[PDB]
Design a protein around this ligand. Structure first.
Ligand code: NI
Length: 341
């Protein structure tokens, strides 16, 4: 049955709640972003209204075959009215099409659901600046102080410099990047741009990327693996057996693979700067795990909440153990005492 933290009090709304069948008293189902833990349960047979971004709606139509008449895309940064309640969709700095949702309840309560997000100071100048928030449904994925990671920009610098150096030393090397859902596209697109190549991939993944509006995408991506020296593969195939096999498939066009696995976090971060990261190597295959996160670090999350000053925080991640829940609640108290709200 539907958890309380997916239900918006005083409305008929739910958020990311499609795996529970027909939710009692739900008149409209919101979807924050196109990741499988959030959309689990949508299909061509769904006949309730779905509210989402333009990008997420392109993905619903094209990949899951949801019928057009049930998809209700909304523009960002725009006040809209849904079943008589004012709503606003805000950029979540997660994956393409990911949003936060602001709900303005008929009684005066204002609710922010972050969906999945990576908090950033740019958010402190959207429609959030203009009013108070009573309840915050918060993406608490990395809500512990051990989770520090670099900026996205520093990580992309590291990847571009590493790939450019490797291919300049050996023009017969291949670069591979792992993927398992939309998000983290900058990794592979920035590498391709510096090498003057397109990114080669499966027709299924190419279709997925064409759903996203990204400007100049016919320019960066392709299904012709032959013409490409950056290849995208399923994350599961990013290991020595998987990559030896792929290399066999390229018919002696290449003699070396350099592969990247963008991960959320790895405990190497507790003891290492980005500048200091090294690969795992076996034969002519090297694998780099890079800390490219699309979720807030602990410090970024803390800053967001101390700026917003919500009256109540409802975590949406790590809620399944008493120890995790208690840990998070202790941090929320610290943050409030330290900021004076
Ligand atoms: Ni997500």
């Amino acid at each position: 049955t539907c958890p309380f933290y997916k239900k918006i009090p005083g409305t008929g709304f739910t958020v990311d709640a499609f795996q529970y069948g027909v939710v009692e008293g739900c008149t409209a189902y919101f979807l924050t972003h196109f990741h499988s833990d959030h959309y689990a349960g949508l299909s061509k047979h769904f006949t309730f209204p779905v509210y989402c971004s333009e990008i997420t709606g392109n993905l619903l139509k094209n990949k899951l075959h949801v019928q057009e008449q049930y998809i209700h895309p909304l523009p960002l940064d725009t006040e809209c009215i849904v079943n008589g309640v004012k709503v606003v969709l805000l950029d979540a700095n997660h994956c393409p099409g990911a949003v936060m949702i602001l709900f303005y309840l008929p009684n005066g309560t204002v609710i922010l659901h972050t969906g999945d997000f990576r908090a950033d100071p740019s958010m402190e100048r959207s429609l959030l600046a203009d009013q108070k928030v009573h309840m915050l449904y918060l993406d608490t994925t990395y809500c512990s102080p051990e989770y520090t990671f670099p900026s996205q920009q520093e990580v992309i610098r590291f990847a571009i410099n590493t790939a450019f150096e490797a291919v300049t030393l050996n023009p017969h090397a291949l670069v591979v990047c792992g993927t398992y859902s939309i998000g983290k596209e900058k990794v592979f697109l920035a590498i391709a741009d510096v090498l003057g190549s397109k990114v080669g991939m499966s027709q299924e993944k190419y279709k997925t990327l064409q759903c996203l509006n990204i400007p100049e995408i016919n320019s960066l991506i392709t299904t012709d693996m032959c013409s490409s020296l950056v290849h995208l593969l399923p994350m599961m195939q990013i290991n020595f057996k998987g990559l030896q096999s792929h290399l066999k498939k390229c018919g002696g066009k290449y003699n070396q693979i350099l592969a990247f696995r963008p991960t959320g976090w790895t405990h190497s971060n507790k003891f290492t700067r980005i500048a200091d990261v090294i690969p795992q190597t076996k034969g002519n295959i090297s694998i780099y795990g890079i800390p490219y996160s699309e979720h807030s670090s602990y410090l970024e999350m803390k800053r967001f909440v101390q700026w917003l000053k919500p009256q109540k925080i409802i975590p949406t991640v790590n809620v399944g153990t008493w120890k995790s829940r208690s840990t998070m609640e202790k941090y929320f108290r610290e943050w409030k005492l330290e900021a004076g709200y």
